Amino acid sequence: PRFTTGLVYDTLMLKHQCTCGSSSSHPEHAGRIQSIWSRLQETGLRGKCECIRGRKATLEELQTVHSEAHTLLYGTNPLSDTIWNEVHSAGAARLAVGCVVELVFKVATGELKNGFAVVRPPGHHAEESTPMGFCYFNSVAVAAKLLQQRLSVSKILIVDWDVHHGNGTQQAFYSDPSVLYMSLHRYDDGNFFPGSGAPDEVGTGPGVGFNVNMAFTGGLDPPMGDAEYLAAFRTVVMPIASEFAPDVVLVSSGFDAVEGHPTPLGGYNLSARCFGYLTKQLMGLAGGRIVLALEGGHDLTAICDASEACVSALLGNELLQQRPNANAVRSMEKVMEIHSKYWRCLQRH
């Protein structure tokens, strides 16, 4: 077994790719994960991590999040800007889901300490019946549902540091107080992609208070960076996360917030190293039981750097104090004042 860092990856996920085979015309391409897998090798980090085997998720599992009609449509293949290979896409989308499910279940059962899924295509945008933002099935969401249904996990924490809002995951657990969805993302008063994820969307029914949207508003004037996300974790995420006290931690790990992402695909000035410190802060929760799933991040050098930092953090290795900008303070203060009504630590904000 080797109670240490885990990893999952499969070459069969590469075959979800347009027949034209170009990087430029389709940002979500096979090279996104292949570059990461090769970087983890070259840095020797793969040689220290245990590499688990991935499987295709069953239609029965996929329907823990999505409708049957939807799962049959993009899960089985007989005979605009979002691609779909008619031979290999169905299998790849299911492998992405299953790869996370397998890894998450290993880390949850104290077999591995923590893990990192190098999967594609992404998931957090994918709702019950509708695919958007180059997502089809919500791999992270399915893994959480299965943890509920098959390992009786009482309290799951989903952190989503992809720069875009995970509308699908928010939808999946909106009525659920046993799952806490935390999203740090570029919002800009609802005028970014996807456009949803307002701070005041706090959940519904039994799950009122367990949906937190750390929505940055004010735009790229100035752009957000390491200090602003660190302030977010320090004053909003970790406080509410520690109070929730989850048995497992899942991370919709999009690195599109990193430097070198143009103004539709990102526009923020975070560093790869910063995601190492965020991963480190999250490791303190759930007795170390954390697993990171790959979401977005087009720029290859940015995601390869960010992945190297996160995996090293998970192993237990290492590597300033800038103030958050006025817009970050203004954004953070809007979340705390809404979530003061549901969380003890924030009562007086």
CB of 242 to ligand 9F4, least distance (A): 26
Q: Which does 84 bind (CB under 5 to 8 A by kind): ligand 9F4, Zn ion, none?
A: none
Q: Which does 70 bind (CB under 5 to 8 A by kind): Zn ion, ligand 9F4, none?
A: none
* Residue of minimal Cβ distance to Zn ion: 296
Cα dihedral: 22, 7, 163, 329 (round 10): -160
CB of 300 to ligand 9F4, least distance (A): 11
Q: Based on C-alpha coordinates, what's the Rg of the chain? A: 19
Give the Cα separation of 69 and 71 in Å (integer). 6
Instruction: Sort strands 156-160 and 50-51 into parallel, antiparallel or unpaired.
Output: unpaired
Residues of this chain that interact with ligand 9F4 (CB under 6 A) are: 27-28, 122, 125, 133-134, 162, 164, 193, 254, 256, 264-265, 295-296, 298
Work out the burial of residue 161: count CB atoms within 10 Å of its CB; fewer than 13 is exposed, 13-18 middle, 19 or more buried: buried
Give the Cα separation of 179 and 171 in Å (integer). 12
**Residue 295 or residue 308: which is nearer to Zn ion going by CB?**
295
Q: Which does 342 bind (CB under 5 to 8 A by kind): ligand 9F4, Zn ion, none?
A: none
Instruction: Report the sign of the C-alpha dihedral through residues 347, 323, 270, 81, in that order.
Output: positive
Other CB atoms within 10 Å distance of the CB of residue 14: 18
Which tokens hold the place of 112? 């591995």
Residues of this chain that interact with Zn ion (CB under 5 A) are: 18, 20, 25, 162, 164, 254, 256, 296
Annotated binding site for Zn(2+): 18, 20, 26
CB of 166 to ligand 9F4, least distance (A): 7
**Residue 116 or residue 343: which is nearer to Zn ion going by CB?**
116
CB of 239 to Zn ion, least distance (A): 25
Backbone angle region of 287, left / alpha / beta, with phi > 0 → left and psi within -120 to 50 → alpha:
left
**Residue 29 or residue 289: which is nearer to ligand 9F4 going by CB?**
29
**Residue 193 or residue 342: which is nearer to ligand 9F4 going by CB?**
193
List 183's β-bridge partners, or say none.
160, 213
Which tokens hold the place of 20? 């034209």
User: Which residues are known to be catalytic?
Assistant: 125
